Amino acid sequence: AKEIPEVLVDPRSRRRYVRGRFLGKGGFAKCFEISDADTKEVFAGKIVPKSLLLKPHQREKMSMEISIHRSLAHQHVVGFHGFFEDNDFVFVVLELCRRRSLLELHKRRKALTEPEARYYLRQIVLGCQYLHRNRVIHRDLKLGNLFLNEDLEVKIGDFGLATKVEYDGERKKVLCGTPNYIAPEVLSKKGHSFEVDVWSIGCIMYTLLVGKPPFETSCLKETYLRIKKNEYSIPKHINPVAASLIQKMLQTDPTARPTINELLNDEFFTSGYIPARLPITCLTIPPRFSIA
Ligand SMILES: Nc1ncnc2c1ncn2C1O[C@H](COP(=O)(O)OP(=O)(O)NP(=O)(O)O)[C@@H](O)[C@H]1O
Ligand SMILES: [Mg+2]
Ligand SMILES: [Mg+2]
Ligand SMILES: [Zn+2]
Secondary structure, eight states: OOOOOOOEETTTEEEEEEEEEEEEEEEEEEEEEEEEEEOOOOEEEEEEGGOOSHHHHHHHHHHHHHHHHHHOTTTBBOEEEEEEOOEEEEEEEEEOOOOOHHHHHHHHHHHHHHHHHHHHHHHHHHHHHHHHHHHTSSSOGGGGEEEEEETTTEEEEEEEEOEESSTTOOOOOOOOOOOOOHHHHHTSSOOOOOOOHHHHHHHHHHHHHHOOOOTOOOOOHHHHHHHHHHHOOOOOOOOOOHHHHHHSSSSSSGGGSSOOHHTTTHHHHHTTTOSEEEEEEESSSSSOOOOO
């Protein structure tokens, strides 16, 4: 079996952490609320057993993730607060996001109001703008990788498929993993860079407004044939300006898409109502956005 330790100690930083409430399993890691015994502050604790990292390549992938993720501090990126290990386990200490991800929100709400979509998309774009000037492609932007804190602020997490562009006009040929909103240039194996993230944000924009993902079928390889052919449609009730931004992002030619630093200056953002913040009720109930 090999049980997880009830207390978790960091030998370099001399910080102790009590294993609180269980949050959920993703792949290898069991995640937990964890408390500094002295500071009482709460974190998310990613906990992977080393019995699942028996392979050097699985260790290298985990090293790259930490190296990339720890190099990052931004308002709309999950804060990296440190990592450590004993003989049996690896430990990652992260910014806690108490209201889970946009996937859970979408499962409960489906199509959001337009101002809600603007609101979440502005923050995702901001977070992803910081990644891109820091030469990081995330490569798996999706609802489940987009976390919400107590104030409904977005935090991009999970740099497991992330890579760093080391030189100019470098085209990545390797992606060990399967992104959810995978770009057509990844699928056709042509080479890829930053535009991959904009593609995925366009899929996110569609899903948040329409209430279902743009290329979904019963078969994953059929989905991939739709992505290759650019085979999707926007329901007529979606406003023309929103529809138009989606179209710009969901182009096959990566050079034809807009840059991450172009996005926030689109008419969709500059000329629509963006709330400063959302009440907690928005997890469950469509906001009306009254003046009362
Ligand atoms: N700060 C956090 N607060 C709460 N849960 C978190 C936090 N960071 C990570 N998690 C999670 O632990 C899991 C680990 O991620 P994992 O499932 O391996 O990859 P993923 O692509 O992020 N998410 P999924 O979309 O669920 O496959 C997530 O699904 C969340 O449940
Ligand atoms: Mg998971
Ligand atoms: Mg990961
Ligand atoms: Zn591999």
